[PDB]
Each structure stands twice: as structure tokens, then as C-alpha cells.
């Protein structure tokens, strides 16, 4: 549940009491954590700026480092140097502690997710061998990440192979709210249903 | 009959209608509302299983039945938006 | 003192206050003996250039600097850097100004206000241009988008990222063709929308009503 | 020759330069103030643009879907200038427009919201009752006259 976390720890870095916790460099890289994992470009944005106490403190750890360095380029656009702190946050962020190790697998599994909704959000389109170019990697490299996370259908996106064009789908508009309401809808029914049924027969 | 009639909007009434701006304003206030209701009727059914009905009704506000007010404003837009549609639809299948 | 509290104001984005604790601030170091207060008094004269800039205000830039008596005292690269970008901003040229920054580099270097507030007018000059010239168009070429601003059509692709983003014009680039629709029509359905939270609420209640329903088993 | 000048802008027409040119040449040229000189012929050039942005106008208002190349023609211009006149006269905010680069339309209007189209579509219903109306009233009357 890293929602509830998020919005608990903010309140931590700009007051802090030290007794039975643990060291306040530690504090600063679970804030950086959920914010990240959490949150979408505009609240995770004018959240580290108008935080003064993660800035004042600049690097002084490695894990802190690797952290911070990650949200510049994800907020910023700079998606060459995006994928380099990917890889550090992994060795020395989630493993040394005892809260995210747990987590290793499910956390860059998610971050890889929100680089990519940001990235076609801005773009109609993309060509396969330009968004390879943008990330680092090569051409082949990108179509078996982009492959784990569209049947499942958190990116809402789908590849043109032979136009090497990659289209984006993803609905904004009023079908987009029809989509969620209607599923909720079933789901009050269900639970009338079944509440109805045992009382009209006990 | 005489004292009846009342009206030339006998037969120009049903197929007479308001713009749909009005009825956008209706369903989007409509709406809005019956959040309001139903956010007191969450107080209150936390409640509704002490001692006597009469003092719940004063304690945690019961008054004026929160359940029949949400029952009321939901069943006036309720019948209005099939009036709504109903004339709608009547007007285009007729007309052309 | 005064140096500090208009630097101060600059970052917190209103000049008007930036700029009289800086004219306080070169009255100072002007009337106290020279000897090493004449280097720091250079400074503050260039502070006071920055200010009307950023308040979009570049005549007044202009009226600071005469040859009577403003140059004369303290006379820099960073003062002919002053005017330089101040007519930048005025033409509306992106080129202009990078060729400012170029030769007067030492300025933006020894000066962080100078550098700091280079970057912030760089990009809203940039971000402002650019709405004007794809504001009667929808399926604009980036290509003929790039001859007008100046710029090359990569840094045109960069922007627009950013700004789709802030979604401060809307819009959707599309790099099949090198196109960019700007899309300017309504978000959101206000009705459908407030339809979502008394959804929202009425599956919140069903949860306590069968908490009365325990009642009756 | 006045009373004719301002008579072509008052209504709205299409009509094109270089017969804007022929004709007002040698007859105001004999005027002065906007015309001979070399500075006020700077001032007889300016009513080149003004021939072309009455033009946009009266296109705005009838197309709402015109073909930029066509435009083109119309105006006697090329791509690029076409261009320029309706981008310095959307900015004034006389008119509105959105141009498609790879030419093939060139869309005068300002995109209508579903309320406003509805809107428009309750008014003719109304109306259209009234019409049947007011006959219904006028052929109670002829029964009498026949």
C-alpha cells in the first residue's frame, strides 16, 4: 500500500522526531520512493520543488543518489539518462533496505509502466527505432518490454510491426469515463444481489 | 370546460420542449446533490442501532429523514429525464 | 543586506520588489570608498538589468544604461550582455539570444541570478512563441514550424514533450508524417464525471447497510 | 467615385487586386493623400492587404471547408503568403481558422460545442409547431371566403 505511505511520509521530512527511527538520509529515500511509484508528472513535480528539505540535502548516500537522480529525468523528459538510474536504484536501493526487498521486482516492473504513459501521452505516434534511440537501447530490446505490459492493458497502446510505428489508443475523452462507471455499476448490482437474496429468505 | 382550459399548450407541450443546455443544468445539479445526501446518510447509518429512534434522529441528525430526502430527489429527476428523452426521441422519428 | 532580499525576490518570481533593494544596493557600494566595493558594485548594476527582463518591461532595461554616467562607472562584458538579451526577448528571436549567451558566457559563469534567470526567460520565451505560431493550425509540419521559430527540429520535437505534459495547449505529435494536431476541443464531461462519486458513495453505504443485516442472521 | 469606393466593403462580395488596381488607378491618382508619392504609395500598398483580408471575411462566413490550394488561386497568391493573411488575421481576432499543412483543407470556423448545435435544433421544433399553427388558423378563415 505505498498510496497511504505517500502521503504519511511528505509530512515526515518537514518534521522529523528521531527516536526509535531510523537514520533521516533513510527518511528522504522512502519519501522519493512512493512519490515516484505513486504519484503522475505534475503532483510529483511541484512535490520535490516545494520541498526544500530533500533539496537543502542534496546526495550524501549512494542510495539517496540513485534515488534522486531518477526523478529528475522522468519529470524533465530526458529518457538517455532515464534508463542508467533505473538499473542503480535496483542495487542500492531496494536491496540494503528491509521495507522495498520485498518489492525488488514489482517496483521497476511499475516504473518501467509510467515512463512509458508519460511518453505516449505527448506522442500520436512513435517509430519503434526512435523510441529505442531515446531510451539507449537497441531496436529488438524495446519489443519484448513493451510486449509483458500490453495484454494486461495498463499502457493501452498496440504495434504497428510492419509500419514500425508503435499507435496509441488510450481514451481521454467521454468513452474513457463510460469505461470506468459501468464496471462499478456491475459491481452494485452484485452487491445488492446477493445481500437481497439472504435477507428475503432468512 | 371553460374554466379548464387553461392553456393553447394542450397539444403543444409534449412535442414544445426546453433546450437541452436547461437539461444539461438539471442532470449535472441533479447529480451533485444527491452526494451531499448521501454522504449524511453515511453519518447517520454508522448510527441506527442504539436506543430509541427518536433520539437518534436529534443526536446525529435523522431530521427530516435523510433516507426519504435522497428517496425525493431521485425520484423527481428520475421521472423528468424520461419525460426528457421521451419527447426527444418522438420529435425526430415523427417529424422527419 | 539589500543584495541578498532583491536576489531573494527574483527566485520567489516578482521583480518589481527584486529591483528596489537593488537600487538601494549600487547607491551603497557607489558612495563607499572604492578598493574592491567597485567589483561588487558592477554586479548590482547588472542585477538591476536583469530584473526589468524578466518584468517584460525592455525599454525600461534600455533607460538605466546611458552613456552619462551608467557605463562610464561600470563597464563589463555582462553590461553589453545586459542590453544584448534585452533585445533578444524584444525581437522575439531564440537565435538572438543564444548568440548573446556565447560571447557572454563569464556572465552567466561568475553571476548565478544571471544564469539562473537566463533559463527561465529562455523557455517561456520559447513556450509563448511557439502558441502563437501553431495557435491557426492542426496538422502543422514541424518542419515549417522550425524555419519561423529558428530553432532546429529536433529541440521543436523536445519542447512540445514538455509541454503536451503541462497540457497547456493540448495536443498529440505524431512523428509517422512529422505532424502535430492541436487539439483544442473540451475535456471531460462535467455530468459523467460528478456520476462517478455518487456511484462512489452509493457502493460505500451498501457495505454499512449490510452491517444492519447482520442484525437479521 | 466615392459613393462606389466604400460600396464594394459595405456588403460582402468577392472581388480581386489587380481590378481593385486597374480601375482606381487613373481616376485617384489625381487625388492626393494615400496615392501618388514615395511614401504614399507605401500607403496605395497597404490596400493590397486589406483587398486580400476582405476577402478571408467573406470565405469565413460562406466556406467553413475550403481546400488551402484553391485558396490560394482565389486570393491570386501563393502558398506561403496565403498562409501569413490568415495567420496575422486570426491573431487580431476577426476570424478563425485551422490550417492543414498537407493542403487539403483549409477550415474556417470556430468548432461548435454539443450544447450549442442542440441548442439550435430545440428552436426549429418550436417553430415548425407554430407554422403549423397559424395555417391551421388561415384555412378556418378561407372556408367562410369560398
Redesign the interface.
Same mark, same amino acid.
Given at each position: 500500500n505505498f498510496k497511504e505511505a505517500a502521503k504519511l511520509l511528505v509530512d515526515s521530512l518537514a518534521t522529523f522526531t528521531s527516536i526509535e527511527l531510523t537514520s533521516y538520509e533513510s527518511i528522504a529515500t522512502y519519501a522519493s520512493v512512493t512519490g515516484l511509484f505513486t504519484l503522475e508528472r505534475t503532483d510529483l513535480k511541484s512535490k520535490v520543488i516545494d520541498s526544500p528539505e530533500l533539496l537543502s540535502l542534496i546526495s550524501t548516500t549512494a542510495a539517496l543518489q540513485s534515488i534522486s537522480s531518477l526523478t529528475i529525468s522522468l519529470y524533465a523528459s530526458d529518457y538517455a539518462s532515464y534508463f542508467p538510474y533505473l538499473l542503480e536504484t535496483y542495487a542500492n536501493v531496494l536491496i540494503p533496505c528491509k521495507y522495498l526487498n520485498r518489492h525488488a521486482d514489482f517496483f521497476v516492473r511499475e516504473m518501467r509502466r509510467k515512463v512509458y504513459a508519460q511518453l505516449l501521452e505527448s506522442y500520436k505516434t512513435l517509430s519503434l527505432k526512435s523510441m529505442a534511440s531515446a531510451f539507449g537501447v537497441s531496436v529488438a530490446f524495446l519489443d519484448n518490454d513493451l510486449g509483458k505490459f500490453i495484454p494486461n492493458k495498463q499502457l493501452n497502446c498496440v504495434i504497428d510491426r510492419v509500419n514500425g510505428i508503435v499507435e496509441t489508443n488510450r481514451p481521454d475523452n467521454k468513452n474513457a469515463q463510460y469505461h470506468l462507471l459501468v464496471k462499478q455499476g456491475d459491481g452494485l448490482l452484485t452487491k445488492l444481489q446477493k445481500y437481497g437474496a439472504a435477507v428475503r429468505l432468512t | 370546460k371553460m374554466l379548464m382550459n387553461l392553456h393553447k399548450e394542450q397539444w403543444?407541450s409534449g412535442?414544445?420542449? %426546453?433546450? %437541452? *443546455?436547461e437539461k *444539461?443544468e438539471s442532470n449535472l445539479a441533479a447529480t451533485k446533490s444527491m452526494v451531499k445526501i448521501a454522504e449524511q446518510y453515511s453519518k447517520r447509518i454508522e448510527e441506527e442501532k442504539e436506543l430509541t429512534e427518536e433520539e437518534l434522529k436529534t443526536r446525529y441528525v435523522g431530521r427530516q429523514d435523510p433516507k426519504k430526502h435522497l428517496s425525493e430527489t431521485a425520484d423527481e429527476t428520475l421521472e423528468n429525464n424520461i419525460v426528457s428523452v421521451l419527447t426527444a426521441g418522438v420529435?425526430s422519428v415523427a417529424?422527419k | 543586506l539589500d543584495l541578498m532580499s532583491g536576489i531573494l525576490h527574483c527566485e520567489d518570481k516578482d521583480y518589481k520588489t527584486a529591483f528596489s533593494y537593488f537600487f538601494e544596493s549600487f547607491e551603497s557600494y557607489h558612495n563607499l570608498t572604492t578598493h574592491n566595493s567597485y567589483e561588487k558594485a558592477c554586479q548590482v548594476l547588472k542585477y538591476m538589468l536583469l530584473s526589468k527582463i524578466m518584468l517584460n518591461l525592455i525599454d525600461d532595461v534600455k533607460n538605466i544604461l546611458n552613456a552619462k554616467y551608467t557605463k562610464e562607472t561600470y563597464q563589463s562584458r555582462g553590461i553589453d550582455a545586459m542590453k544584448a538579451v534585452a533585445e533578444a526577448y524584444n525581437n522575439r528571436s531564440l537565435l538572438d539570444f543564444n548568440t548573446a549567451l556565447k560571447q557572454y558566457e563569464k556572465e552567466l559563469m561568475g553571476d548565478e541570478l544571471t544564469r539562473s534567470h537566463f533559463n527561465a526567460l529562455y523557455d517561456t520565451l520559447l513556450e509563448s512563441n511557439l502558441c502563437?505560431i501553431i495557435? !491557426?493550425?492542426?496538422?502543422?509540419?514541424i518542419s515549417?514550424i522550425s524555419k519561423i521559430i529558428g530553432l532546429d527540429t529536433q529541440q521543436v520535437e523536445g519542447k512540445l514533450s514538455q509541454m503536451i505534459l503541462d497540457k497547456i495547449f493540448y495536443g498529440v505529435l505524431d512523428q509517422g508524417n512529422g505532424?502535430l494536431y492541436?487539439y483544442?476541443? !473540451?475535456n471531460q464531461d462535467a455530468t459523467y464525471d460528478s456520476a462517478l462519486e455518487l456511484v462512489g458513495q452509493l457502493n460505500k453505504v451498501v457495505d454499512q447497510l449490510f452491517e444492519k443485516a447482520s442484525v437479521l442472521y | 467615385s466615392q459613393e462606389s469606393l466604400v460600396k464594394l466593403f459595405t456588403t460582402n462580395e468577392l472581388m480581386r487586386w489587380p481590378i481593385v488596381q486597374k480601375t482606381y488607378e487613373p481616376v485617384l491618382n489625381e487625388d492626393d493623400l494615400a496615392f501618388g508619392g514615395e511614401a504614399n504609395k507605401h500607403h496605395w500598398e497597404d490596400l493590397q492587404k486589406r483587398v486580400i483580408e476582405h476577402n478571408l471575411r467573406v470565405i469565413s462566413e460562406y466556406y467553413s471547408r475550403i481546400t488551402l490550394l484553391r485558396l490560394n488561386e482565389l486570393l491570386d497568391l501563393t502558398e506561403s503568403q496565403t498562409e501569413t493573411y490568415?495567420?496575422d488575421l /486570426? +491573431?487580431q481576432g476577426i476570424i478563425?481558422?485551422? /490550417? +492543414?499543412? @498537407?493542403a487539403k483543407i483549409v477550415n474556417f470556423e470556430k @468548432?461548435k460545442?454539443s450544447?450549442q448545435l $442542440?441548442?439550435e435544433?430545440?428552436?426549429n /421544433?418550436?417553430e $415548425? $409547431?407554430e407554422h403549423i399553427?397559424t395555417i391551421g388558423h388561415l384555412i378556418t378563415k378561407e372556408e367562410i371566403m369560398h
Open positions: - | 403543444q412535442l414544445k420542449m %426546453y433546450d %437541452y *443546455e *444539461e420529435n417529424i | 502563437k495557435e !491557426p493550425f492542426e496538422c502543422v509540419e515549417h505532424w492541436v483544442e476541443t !473540451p | 490568415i495567420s /486570426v +491573431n478563425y481558422a485551422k /490550417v +492543414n499543412r @498537407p @468548432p460545442n450544447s $442542440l441548442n435544433w430545440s428552436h /421544433v418550436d $415548425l $409547431l399553427e
